[PDB]
Symmetry: D2
């Protein structure tokens, strides 16, 4: 099966190292990006499906690196149905679970936290809600977990540790040994960073992070309560861990992180999540909002903001997507400046603070959205011929 997207005004690659591709044509074959170039690719198109981008912008499908899933497409935290479908219409094609703290009666012992992670991992792989690639089993560390539990979880398809600090495992002395077992058996590890619900140890320090050694510093701008700029500095300077900016966090610290990362050349490490469902709410346009806020308020190139939502995120998680390059999964968005925006194109809209209009979303090359029900309308909508 073959699909060609033609007449592309701008291709944003999602790769921070070279964020724009000098090409106007993308060929998709058997769910993968096959070729990127010019009109020469249209000869020998055969019976391909043709999508006319009508001069608009193609980006990778967005990742939300911080979703609190609990099974299927219902969110108990805010009593919301169909929230994953809604996020897809905001461009989100892959979701990473940050753990399931809202699972009703969440099992908090070692066997229970394990069984829940296994359940959610298998269930989301069995059924992609609205076609979204949900990596749904992110184990919450609890006292009593052994190395064999991590071996068992890996056997059953679990490969993510959810926010360290959500369970009974909180201080680095207890966390580090488990994080070590996790890493030894192929897990990616997240860590809650910011204000906590405990009057004793109310915040999370750089030393905590440094000693625990997560792959991802979760909500570095707070969830929603932020760590100090002093601790931000130490995390940025003393580690190479991913620095996750979340929509449901502190915008001042988000700006600080973005600006300092630009100063220090650390933008490749910045990844976007929602941290929702949460007390804040549920925001299907959350990742686009992150991109618009960072680009429009923190003086980051909109193409680089796209990388923060896409390739930066898949780089940390080791996924074969989030980047427009041959061999990568064909998860793609066709978007434009929205009607009435001062901006001439999608990247211009992002830089101006306007959420772009999404026309088409592909997952594995298949059209799963042909007009977003959530974004404002694209000025130039893609047409599937």
């Amino acid at each position: 099966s073959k699909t060609i997207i033609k007449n592309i005004g701008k291709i944003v690659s999602g790769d921070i190292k070279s964020p724009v591709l000098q090409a106007d044509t993308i060929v998709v074959e058997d769910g993968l990006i096959a070729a990127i170039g010019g009109e020469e690719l249209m000869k020998d198109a055969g019976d391909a499906t043709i999508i006319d981008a009508a001069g608009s912008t193609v980006t990778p499908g967005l990742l939300d690196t911080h979703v609190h899933v609990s099974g299927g497409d219902y969110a108990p935290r805010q009593k919301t149905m169909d929230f994953i479908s809604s996020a897809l219409h905001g461009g989100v094609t892959t979701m990473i679970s940050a753990g399931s703290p809202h699972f009703p009666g969440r099992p908090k012992d070692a066997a229970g936290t394990k069984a829940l992670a296994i359940t959610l991992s298998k269930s989301y792989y069995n059924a992609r809600p609205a076609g979204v690639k949900v990596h749904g089993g992110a184990v919450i560390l609890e006292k009593g977990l052994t190395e064999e539990d991590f071996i068992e979880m890996k056997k059953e398809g679990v490969w993510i540790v959810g926010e360290v600090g959500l369970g009974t495992i909180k201080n680095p002395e207890d966390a580090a040994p488990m994080v070590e077992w996790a890493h030894k058996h192929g897990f990616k590890v997240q860590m809650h960073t910011g204000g906590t619900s405990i009057p004793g140890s109310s915040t999370v320090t750089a030393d905590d992070v440094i000693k625990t050694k997560p792959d991802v510093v979760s909500h570095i701008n707070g969830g929603p309560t932020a760590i100090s700029v002093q601790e931000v500095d130490r995390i940025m300077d003393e580690t190479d861990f991913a620095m996750e900016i979340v929509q449901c966090g502190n915008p001042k610290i988000a700006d600080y992180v973005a600006r300092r990362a630009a100063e220090k050349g650390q933008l490749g490490r910045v990844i976007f999540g929602n941290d929702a469902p949460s007390g804040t709410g549920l925001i299907p346009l959350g990742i686009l909002r992150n991109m618009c806020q960072i680009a429009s308020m923190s003086d980051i190139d909109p193409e680089v903001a796209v990388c923060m939502a896409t390739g930066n995120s898949t780089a940390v998680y080791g996924l074969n997507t989030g980047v427009i390059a041959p061999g990568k999964e064909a998860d793609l968005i066709i978007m434009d400046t929205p009607l009435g925006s001062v901006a001439e194109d999608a990247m211009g809209a992002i830089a101006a603070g306007d959420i772009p209009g999404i026309s088409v979303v592909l997952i594995d090359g298949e059209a799963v959205v042909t007009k977003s029900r959530n974004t404002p309308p694209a000025k130039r909508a893609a047409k599937i011929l």
Copy 2:
């Protein structure tokens, strides 16, 4: 019925003329604020309910000036139950309907748009969801409405015109005459400002706004697509209309509006809404987020950010609330810096970009929240004795 709130660390009034009150005790009598002062008000307490603010902050209950209600506490736009109850836990005690475009099969003729406005106006006055004061009937202007229709609507308790532009009445030549009739019969009038679903008339200009003469320029920072800075300049400089900053809008333009309003002495005109339910999502902490955003990013005193969410808004709508002053309705929040925040108090938290922890919320003096289920935890929680 009498309630006394004692041991208050800071009183934020909601009145931009004097944002802080140098007092530590508040007396509530028969649903109204009766006295503001020192410990002398504790004399002859009697059977009064005593609330210990534990050295934290008292503000007015927040207004959301831009809610798209549709009956009760269910939002079809994002398939969300109990969203008003949720907003209450983010401090929202009064909501203004911006109209009901999501009402299923929304009647779009003159008789139908009127009937729906009357229905929702009466229904929300009959049943306050979770105790929230919802002004739920905001008529959407459609072709065929007469002055008599406005007289009838006023008789039946309707006094708000929802975002002009949501219905078939769009251009100023059609809108102006109806807004005249509305204003003649005691209505407050809202107007959609920014990008629209119309390709031909893609944006709403300042000329449109100046000609139509609404009381409120709805989502001046876009819903979510913003007008140009040049059009913002003109609305700010050529009118005295309220300028509504919404959570589901352009953050760059929100910053521009706030900073320019500060330079031009127009901060009293700025009011906060969510513009939700919408494509963006549903954000019960949305008004708090507006406050933190404007305070931490636009260099606005957090006390004045409170005014934008409270007294500025009730001033525009002529409501006897949103201000801590004798004779005003006793809608009050007790809040603090959240656990782990670098800030020492609630106002400090807001200026730092951290959502404050809400402990207690009163509506008409009655405790409707005793611990927020949505905000981070307050460092010092108020206790009802």
Copy 3:
């Protein structure tokens, strides 16, 4: 637009005077039943859509004469989303509102009850949820309504009065004049019959019904509390009003009503509703269950039970549907005995107490269901070729 259903094993007409049609082919043209006959009707089919009934049974689409709607497809009484599309998968193609007592903060004055009925009438005609024909505006009688109000409502498309007794109008002395105005202006009238919430007047008598003169005696078997058999006798014998058996009512009295009506030649007056959403629940297979219950427990022929759910109901309401006859609206079900049933066909299943499997549902000739998501599976499924 033309559709032909061929290879029909049994046609059940919905007309109690002739419950079975000796034919095996139905032609639908422009949303209406055009012809019923044999294979000759297949000649020169041309571009026609062909549906192979696979030797199974065709019946009219079912009516639910007692639905408590409140706008769109959400039911606040039991916090249920998409209940109307669910009922469609139980074969329900038309719904009659019995009033909207669950509308949150339901307006209870004359002007409010009017405004709500107009709103719901218009909204449901604007948007058929899942394609279902919902007659959604059934005014609840309240003190203060005048004849001019009924004139206004009729002008705006309202033609139903909901259960008399749901509002402040309760006793026959107050009700009779209003019902008189209703009937004068072309309204159909329902009346609550059974146990009430008032300790003083705890029940409804035949005298009440005789004096009030509704078209439909709502929930004659109770909603859920039944009137006595003595009162049932008088309603059956002293009036010609429709006798509505509801799913959410008393099964002993349902049986009594069915058996006595058979004895007295009054089966044409028996009509089926759910009386849901209600305290009992929400039962999308409710009308089918009524048919199965009456056929299997009350010794009523299954074909006559079909009439009670279809033609008996549309006759009372004067709707051009519910009967398989030329010129009637092409609302049709193709159904069969369910897998594993002792019965050999759909009617046999109903008589045996087994809910039939629904394969196809047409509304105005368009396929809105091609396999029921709610019924057990049909042994022989219809196929659209």
Copy 4:
């Protein structure tokens, strides 16, 4: 902690061996029934909570032995929120999971079905929705499960096998060995008995049941499609397994089973469930309706129908509740004839076919309902003094 219920007009025990207790006073101590008797028990009450039954009826809290839970209080099958809370208002204080077929993306391998059962078992014991005792982890048998899997599940608190036939284990030849392992390690076993979704083997026979050896013959009257009377007779006569009559099943077969069980002395084996959520709907008054239907249509004493909903069910599952006897868990309903009913008391109402009014529900002696939101109003309401 002590509670006394006084002024009771009738006590229905839930014990089929002695269905009525000739007493008017019940003492509850530390969550258990302490004593049953007369006025003498009111002596030296002290600080005991006193509940005045107002001359109405006390029964045990009802069981629903066939609930398809899937985590928390949301039901995906019918998109219903808060269904367990709703069932509590229908008197349901204990639920038995029949398995979780509706879990989104339900894991179907051995490891996954195990993980899911462990998760649900633990989660429902951690958090009782609305106070309801949910036995939530009922494993669905899948090919690949071993005796060791059952040892592991038992260790983690799982003790129920959900309907045999929901998963890849369908043939009695495959099921019997697994059911043996379950019984060896303390499990109670359910078995789907009725029409299936496999055309090849479309039903379940008595021989299937005899070979499999479940504890409960699930939905003996169909789910919703019934087995034949021929198979019913043999199950009744050749096994001593529990015969579950479900609300979402065939009423003719329900009547056949109840009547034949009365003739054969087998009423102690009859237990009640809903089989919901299901295609039929969600019926919070479903257990009450079961009692009303069997008492009013099948000539079963209403006190015996209560046993079928209570003590019969807890006997099968080995639970220390369902019966008013000293030492049993204090799960109790106070109920009456509903307003307007021909019946003078609660049992009379059930026999008459009228759902009784529930005033108070206790779980572990704690008042979880003080007025049912779902049943009609009790004539005489209990009052906590």
